[PDB]
Design a protein around this nucleic acid. Structure first.
Ligand SMILES: C[C@@H](O)[C@H](N)C(=O)NS(=O)(=O)OC[C@H]1O[C@@H](n2cnc3c(N)ncnc32)[C@H](O)[C@@H]1O
Ligand SMILES: C[C@@H](O)[C@H](N)C(=O)NS(=O)(=O)OC[C@H]1O[C@@H](n2cnc3c(N)ncnc32)[C@H](O)[C@@H]1O
Ligand SMILES: [Zn+2]
Ligand SMILES: [Zn+2]
Lengths: 401, 401
RNA sequence: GGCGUAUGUGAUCUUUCGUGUGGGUCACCACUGCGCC
RNA sequence: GGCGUAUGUGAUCUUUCGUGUGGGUCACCACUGCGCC
């Protein structure tokens, strides 16, 4: 179904009018959000990315330089103190550059992979807003790569590979590529865009990724490979993206030293795998439709007693499981077990554990997937070791399926 | 020494003028920042707190209601779209209340512990700024507790206890308490503040915490227990804090159902243990003075070869250790081992591993604390198991000290 | 936007009941769905 | 704010050297410290 509903459904979040296009991440939604971060971190570790964090706003003067002010100022939010006037960051590109500029960087510091779960803000037109897909305030999972241009290849490829290798974890079928070309208001010489565009295209076809030119689209600062995923109504949504920047690195004057002990402006690659935390979450919801894989489930397990007897043996287990590091909860409520199983199933809990008198003098637990498949009572540790296995591997399929 | 120095020193971060009072968290500082979160999360799990996340800004109209607009508007930042005009959040109190208002809450939903690593912004006077201690843009580790007033006690105590039990991890000696009373521009009836103040005080003395009234201080919305830690120049700095709110919950009209099936406005307790991520970090730096405990160390280990030979056996180990989940790095650079040991020691790496020909045909590693104590070569797994031990327990003392 | 409902939400009496909501009373519309203006 | 330096940063030749910086050349002031205006 529609994420917006499943969201209200599973208490993943909510939104209010006094905060248009601003998400009020509820506890459970958060968990998903958060759990995604840990995932990203994980994938990035291999490729050795640096995780930074930039200012929530900088001086308007800065953006004037980058170009944002002259071709984006309409989507930019702004405040100011007695001091100057600042823009709330739309992207984290400028920021990263600043951090890059501290000190003298040699070619040997390249390629420089700097990532950040950067919180952005954009004055998206009232009309264009939509659930977690198109919001005024989101969180990119981007990074920017500083590198020589011989590095551009391997560098871009690594990105691509990362997008697929990562999306694959969610088992996405529809992944269509687009290659947006020099937009109306760009900032580099055609000569630059020529190379930039070529480079990207070459990359695609060099990995045999089929695509179409998004002609007239793309960063005001460079060509842009777009990875689009689709939703409930098979509507296209841009999620991942790899952009080749030739201006900015110079505009904010960054540079490194070659062996020729010479000043060289680095090349800068923009890129976000999931794209935007809220948007990508929206898609996951859309896909699985409330059936987030065990690892990504707000609540992973539910242990319930049949009568007010085994209620202690339930607290017992919910405990052992909580230490096991499993998002578990106990439904000891005074209700018919049938009810419990109901509520939680439309709640989507990957696993439900029934504890009746029978199981108490067994140390066993009546296991049952949300899908309904009664997995039959089984050893405690057993369920744990197995759940952990399923979570640890962020596997999509549950036990016995 | 002064954090501001140690910071520039260990590349923990930097600041620029176009972004006054806004931190540019560099990779290694971030690590510390981040590692603190994981710590907070941890301590909060026990007490079962919900981790949400609110809007980076809401409608001015909202704050007019809470009171912020009429007695804080000066420290508040503001932007706006065609739509309305918003204030950048100073606190996350309002937000949390919004999230609390979704649905009908019964008394049984209480006490409601809602936490968030809420990113705040305040127009602190140019003059009052100072390193990480007093910034325009920081990250509170607060939460807000919704509860009946019989719960106020146990609730506040739980906070107190949390502050100590947590601070104790860092071995803080100077922890002085203050109890700020109804400020100039408050928002509740004296009658309310009377109770509010009393309550807090009772709490303190009930736990035998010595203190002094900060008369005239305290939230425009309630009394305020202050936990002050001291820095390099033994200057007082407010870190932890527990505030008893009696207005806001009603101002934003929140309520729960008693058994009397009746509408009751909840009592709300504000509270931040570390206080502010940046500030507390500042203090840690000041204290340890660049000697962050193993668990908190931007880099925990460094493995270096003596000659270009054992260089592979180094990549070897740095690997095994990286999988061990230890922030480790290899200094294979073409330099005298003595140099390496130097640089990294003033860099503060908790541990340095020398790998010479001798150790290559031993599988052993020449271990040596940053303090200098040569721990003598020892088994690899051995060092690992031991380091993990030290990290897992966030112990302050290193191996053999 | 307003009003009213309920297989909605909450309180509550009864029920103690083995796997998609047991029975009743009261409250409210904040969530969900349905009506009316 | 500007200028100049180096036990500062970078490049580089030499050095391969066992635990707080080996020797030289060049570059620059972005980091750190020191000077001058
Ligand atoms: C990739 C970054 O380094 C680059 N600076 C950048 O900002 N790229 S972007 O502007 O093309 O956006 C990256 C991704 O953010 C997400 N995103 C962009 N705008 C929004 C929005 N309004 N709401 C939600 N997600 C968004 C999309 O997944 C998009 O692919
Ligand atoms: C505790 C919260 O629920 C409450 N809303 C609140 O805002 N408390 S506060 O305003 O007293 O600040 C809490 C803590 O934030 C930190 N803090 C406040 N202002 C700043 C600042 N300008 N820079 C750095 N840290 C700050 C301090 O550690 C302070 O104790
Ligand atoms: Zn970018
Ligand atoms: Zn608060």
């Amino acid at each position: 179904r529609d994420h917006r509903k499943i969201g209200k459904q599973l208490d993943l979040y909510h939104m209010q009018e006094e905060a248009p296009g601003m998400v009020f991440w509820h506890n459970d939604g958060w968990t998903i959000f958060r759990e995604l971060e840990v995932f990203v971190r994980s994938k990035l570790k291999e490729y050795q990315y640096q995780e930074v964090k930039g200012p929530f706003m900088m001086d308007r003067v800065l953006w004037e330089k980058t170009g944002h002010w002259d071709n984006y100022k309409d989507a930019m939010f702004t405040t100011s103190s007695e001091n100057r006037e600042y823009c709330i960051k739309p992207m984290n590109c400028p920021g990263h550059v600043q951090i890059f500029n501290q000190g003298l960087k040699s070619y040997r510091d390249l390629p420089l992979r700097m990532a950040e779960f950067g919180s952005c803000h954009r004055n998206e037109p009232s009309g264009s807003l939509h659930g977690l897909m198109r919001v005024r305030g989101f969180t990119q999972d981007d990074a920017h790569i500083f590198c020589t241009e011989e590095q551009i290849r391997d560098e871009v490829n690594g990105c691509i590979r990362l997008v697929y290798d990562m999306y694959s974890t969610f088992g996405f079928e529809k992944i269509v590529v687009k290659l947006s070309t020099r937009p109306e208001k760009r900032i580099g010489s055609d000569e630059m865009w020529d190379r930039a565009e070529a480079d990207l295209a070459v990359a695609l076809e060099e990995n045999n990724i089929p695509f179409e030119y998004q002609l007239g689209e793309g960063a005001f600062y460079g060509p842009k490979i777009e990875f689009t995923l689709y939703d409930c109504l098979d509507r296209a949504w841009q999620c991942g993206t790899v952009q080749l920047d030739f201006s900015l690195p110079s505009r904010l004057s960054a540079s490194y030293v070659g062996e020729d002990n010479e000043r060289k402006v680095p090349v800068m690659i923009h890129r976000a795998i999931l794209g935007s935390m809220e948007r990508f979450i929206g898609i996951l919801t859309e896909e699985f439709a409330g059936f987030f894989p065990t690892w990504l489930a707000p609540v992973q397990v539910v242990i319930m007693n049949i009568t007010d007897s085994q209620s202690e043996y339930v607290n017992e287990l919910t405990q052992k499981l909580s230490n096991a590091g499993i998002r578990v909860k106990a439904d000891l409520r005074n209700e018919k077990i049938g009810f419990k199983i109901r509520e939680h199933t439309l709640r989507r809990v990957p696993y439900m554990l029934v504890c009746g008198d029978k199981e108490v003098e067994s140390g066993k637990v009546a296991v049952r997937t949300r899908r309904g498949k009664d997995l039959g009572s089984m050893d405690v540790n057993e369920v744990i070791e197995k759940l952990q296995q399923e979570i640890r591997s962020r596997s999509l399929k549950q036990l016995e399926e």
